[PDB]
Symmetry: D2
Subunit: 249 residues, 4 copies
């Protein structure tokens, strides 16, 4: 009987790529989504047409609040309800937007950027662990956290917190046989609303090929970390950035 | 006239040593505190005896909540109301306690640990910057963040987020001439409630002299970073750890 | 036609496991060695028994010297001579022993530890790149514990740090030629056969993930990933394979 | 009696600023140099005019070779011969030039870049420690070593090695009371042969003031690390880079 995985923010883009590649490897998947209901259901439909009763959707807001723990617990519960087990958690969902130091309130900005990128991963990790084979968690990090975009403090804080979670949880969950690792893209699929000229400015900075990573390339590193070929790896973050983080100003 | 500094959690231990040292260097000081009212008032009294009208107290809970932004605005504002300027911010206040992944409600644990260690520092940084010469911010980090204590995930997340804030704010505030740096203790004054035997266990691990840092030694590094001797340093984090972080398991 | 790989220090242990997995994946290999001559020749023999003329050996001392560049060029040359191409270089060979700051001379310690761990990797990378005439890559065997080093191993540690710098520098510089450069950083893997079990257990007990050392094959699995089409966008990265060891405070 | 310091490559630029400031602080100094004999003697003359018998020169090639240990041993001996003691070692001398992977031989390139930047620091460290109040070593590192200049692999290798030495020697020498630390410039005094256009190009990248560090600014951080205000600091590398290393491509 097939293992099962939760992928957060899996309706589109990198999360969908990761859900698809896990499914093709033999996983049943929970496709978490927030606003993208149609895309989520559409993906689950495609996956179920390939193998029946192997995909489900689960809607959750991952903004920080006093109910975020309940929400995270429910996402994990959804995997146990559909599949009877939960082998892999992929923390992919991420809010990303500028929060200049010098319109959402600042309260909202902190709640969304810290909640999605860091607090929700921690609460999902807690629920995943409490409910417990090749068990692992993969966190989607950011290769450029030490050379950040100007005016993105809250986003940067959240991704650095996520690094701290990866290490702390790797350490504490190791005795339970749960590995915890990260994949850190540089530039991968560009924002939908980004103009082509602005996309090319990013592409030209990448040493390896002057192009963004495909979603599938990101997913490839996720698949490695969840596989038997990574059974000794925990607390590691693999950059998948085409050399981008190595380029000086 | 004399420059002014806000020091958070400045009633006792390291924050106290920082407040004293800045005051001895010629700063007027706001001593922020949460529960230690008697100690804070007592410190202001002692400093004011040295030089009249140079120390005040400001009480605030730095727990994350929808009122935290207003609280942080108020702290900065207290420095302006007392001293008519605010030249230095020291983010020292910190909650610290275990938050096991497998085990106060979880939402309280999040609010306290992430609020004090990261979100309060971000909001203070915003309030400080907006209100704006040798301007700088010093964040109290942690030298052991990459080799964390077992079961301290939320604390570790908060301190990693603080590293992210230090970098992101250094970059963003550099055009305004505000420097942003960190000081990362290893083992300094041990928890008052920790037994002498457990304290000795940590002391024994420290290569440089088999002892913890004094609060004064931590304050020394803060003083350097705020000084004109650090005029070109921003985005740097100075460990003050006696070599502890270099020691393998 | 099959690709070809050079693996340094490939006679035994992790270098051996790397050569074997590459060979199992379809690579032709050069097994470089220094003192383990019988093990190197027998390994290549067992590989050639599996598939004819798919393995050669090349002996070289990788101590720093004025002849080291020539040796390194010859190692790369031996891959082109045998197989007509060189797709993969694995810098695996390593000297490891204490060099306290406070039976070899210091100049010998410098030459062996900096030579094998850093200078020879640089010189091999140079010859590798220059000889290029679809998936080219270099993998450098780093060390997960380089920021929490063993007492009295300054030269070793300096060599492994330099190796980090080479991985980054060569990744940036070689990216325009489509050559990826990455690292694998073991924590504790195969401990010396001769180390007492009670000593081995001291190390094993410190590892979070299973209180055991990595197998050689576990280390090789990461190299195999980095050289594969699943890692085509990865360059300049160093994957720790340490079971959480570098996370553990003193 | 006044303490004594060895500064390598001290005839010009940053090493000169370091020797000057150490001298202004009360230290007697050994001004090591390789080719700059006139500039070295001129500097010794200025310092001895200020305080007689407080400065000496010592010539040495720091290229790697089988006699480099003897040369490093002699530099340390020259401090004992002039001053009767050796309290501080500043590893400042550095060769810097491109060594592309694709008129010096490669053997020479290796010997010069790895010897000056790494092996000579190790051998000086060894001799410093073997001949042994407030003892310390300060290594001049490089803030940009993780985002290196294209075609500078040997230089980068040497500076990364120097980080490893800083850590390993801090750990090993701590029991003897010798601290070991680093200062990592970003862009400071720009090279002798660089056009105005190219100087401005680098200046423009620096967040904090769009200018390079002064030699004195670099020296200020060295002074801090050897001072009594740094007595618990060992194994630390302080970036002095005006935020340069924080800037993405
Ligand atoms: N793409 C890139 O270039 C890079 C990506 N990364 C990281 O890789 C991962 C994937 O990147 P990418 O696919 O571009 O991510 P996206 O920006 O496309 O976001 C992924 C999903 O996050 C979900 N999400 C956003 N806000 C919330 C919220 N409040 N509650 C719940 N879910 C929410 C959304 O779900 P929905 O649509 O259902 O609302 C969204 O589809 C991220 O973690 C990202 O930070 C790192 C660096 C670069
Ligand atoms: N001591 C050490 O060994 C180490 C220290 N550090 C860092 O150095 C800094 C100072 O350390 P140390 O002096 O030991 O710290 P403490 O643990 O003594 O905490 C400092 C102050 O933080 C304040 N604080 C705690 N919770 C809150 C809250 N909810 N709202 C507002 N303020 C709050 C308290 O104020 P009050 O008393 O008024 O209630 C407390 O006195 C901290 O940031 C710490 O993380 C890092 C590594 C180790
Ligand atoms: N095993 C572990 O726990 C760890 C391993 N590593 C790294 O992993 C890699 C593989 O480790 P492992 O298999 O244990 O390494 P070994 O200690 O077994 O050494 C690997 C090979 O290096 C060769 N070598 C040594 N000196 C020279 C020299 N002067 N000239 C040429 N070749 C030489 C030897 O070849 P010969 O036998 O033919 O003389 C030896 O077999 C190394 O780079 C190592 O540093 C990192 C962390 C820990
Ligand atoms: N300046 C900057 O922007 C940056 C500097 N740094 C580091 O800061 C330190 C000082 O920088 P800077 O003053 O610009 O350095 P320089 O390039 O000016 O060199 C310092 C001295 O090193 C000596 N040196 C060079 N080769 C040898 C050799 N073979 N043997 C002995 N001594 C030798 C030279 O002495 P002589 O003149 O007597 O021949 C030279 O004057 C260096 O370690 C450098 O890497 C780091 C990053 C940036
Ligand atoms: C550089 C960079 C980093 C990113 C990033 C885009 C770019 C260009 N993304 C990040 N997170 C999320 N959630 N979405 C997007 C907008 C695609 N991180
Ligand atoms: C190792 C260690 C890390 C610390 C730490 C103590 C120890 C032993 N402290 C931290 N933060 C806060 N707020 N207080 C205290 C308890 C003093 N970090
Ligand atoms: C970026 C940069 C890094 C440097 C550097 C200059 C620049 C611009 N220098 C380095 N080391 C030595 N020895 N001299 C010089 C040339 C001044 N490192």
């Amino acid at each position: 009987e097939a293992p099962a995985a939760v992928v957060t923010g899996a309706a589109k883009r990198i999360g969908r790529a990761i859900a698809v590649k896990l499914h093709q490897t033999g996983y049943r998947v929970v496709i978490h989504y927030h606003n993208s209901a149609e895309a989520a259901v559409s993906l689950a439909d495609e996956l179920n047409k390939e193998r029946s009763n192997t995909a489900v959707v689960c809607q959750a807001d991952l903004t920080n609040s006093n109910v975020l723990p309940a929400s995270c617990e429910e996402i994990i519960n959804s995997c146990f309800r559909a599949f009877g087990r939960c082998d892999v958690l992929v923390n992919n969902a991420s809010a990303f937007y500028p929060t200049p130091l010098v319109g959402k309130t600042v309260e909202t900005q902190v709640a969304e950027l810290i909640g999605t990128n860091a607090i929700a991963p921690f609460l999902l990790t807690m629920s995943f662990a409490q409910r417990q084979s090749n068990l692992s968690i993969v966190n989607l990090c950011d290769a450029m956290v030490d050379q950040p975009c100007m005016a993105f403090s809250l986003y940067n804080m959240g991704k650095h917190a996520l690094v701290g979670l990866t290490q702390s949880a790797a350490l504490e969950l190791a005795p339970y046989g749960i590995r915890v690792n990260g994949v850190a893209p540089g530039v991968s699929l560009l924002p939908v609303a980004m103009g082509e000229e602005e996309k090319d400015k990013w592409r030209r900075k990448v040493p390896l090929g002057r192009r963004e990573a495909s979603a599938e390339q990101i997913a490839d590193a996720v698949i490695f970390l969840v596989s038997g070929s990574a059974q000794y790896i925990t607390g590691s973050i693999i950059k998948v950035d085409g050399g981008l983080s190595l380029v000086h100003a």
